[PDB]
Design a protein around this ligand. Sequence first.
Ligand SMILES: *[C@@H]1O[C@H](CO)[C@@H](O[C@@H]2O[C@H](CO)[C@@H](O)[C@H](O)[C@H]2NC(C)=O)[C@H](O)[C@H]1NC(C)=O
Lengths: 35, 50, 100, 97
Amino acid sequence: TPIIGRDFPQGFSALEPLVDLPIGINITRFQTLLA
Amino acid sequence: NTLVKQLSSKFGAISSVLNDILSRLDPPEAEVQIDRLITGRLQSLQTYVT
Amino acid sequence: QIAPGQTGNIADYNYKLPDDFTGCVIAWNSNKLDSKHSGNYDYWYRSLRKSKLKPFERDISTEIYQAGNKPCKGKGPNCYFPLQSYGFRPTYGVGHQPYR
Amino acid sequence: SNCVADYSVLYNFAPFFAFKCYGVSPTKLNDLCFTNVYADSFVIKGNEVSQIAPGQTGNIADYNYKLDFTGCVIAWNSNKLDSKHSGNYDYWYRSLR
Ligand SMILES: *[C@@H]1O[C@H](CO)[C@@H](O[C@@H]2O[C@H](CO)[C@@H](O)[C@H](O)[C@H]2NC(C)=O)[C@H](O)[C@H]1NC(C)=O
């Protein structure tokens, strides 16, 4: 989403589906990864 | 009183109470019996409204 | 047990199949290329689990099942291995033969 | 008839080396009894315990009685009863058949 550099306009937008990854596991927790 | 009384009917189901259907029958069989009770109960409401 | 709505050691602890299911279940007898005379113990199924499985979940673990109330570790009065092997052999009846 | 089918007392009665059962489950919630459970009780050798299995033969389970059945057993030797070499025959079965 292109946005103004800092402030949110708090407008409306929507996301599109990209992928179905059938891992088939119990997911209860998550974390992000640093580069 | 008639509309409430109809809730005790089975309409061919094994029991008029939904919890007995879920307790006694495997999910797909419970679904068949539930659709049967749903049909009977919604027909009772349409009769009442008409 | 490989059908929507079924209950049993496989339907509940190894593979729950959805109730709203579209697809085909294809099965055939496989005594050939299996069921060696000495017992084919390469195939295992889960018999002990904490809870019933959700559709298509595959929880693959060797966690020791605690059957009793008193805590234990590894092996003991209340500690049982969760998987049960089955020795397929040519001498078993049809209900006890392997199927692919 | 005043049965209940509380199986926690059987489990707690003695430790098991292994369950050695052909039908392990919680076995109801111990409040209500269902079906005629029955108990066909006898004492056999450690290898005979494995011989009596669904679809199995061996020497035992061809002689005596064939085992569809739940094999849940308190798999513990009553050493206090079998401590003598001459023992007794209180648990006999027709192994000759
Ligand atoms: C997915 O994982 C969670 C947590 O690891 C499981 O939740 C536990 O389930 C056991 C068995 O019912 C309970 O004794 C625990 O108390 C639960 N944890 C919590 C934090 O409540 C959950 O059961 C797993 N999903 C499946 C399908 O097994």
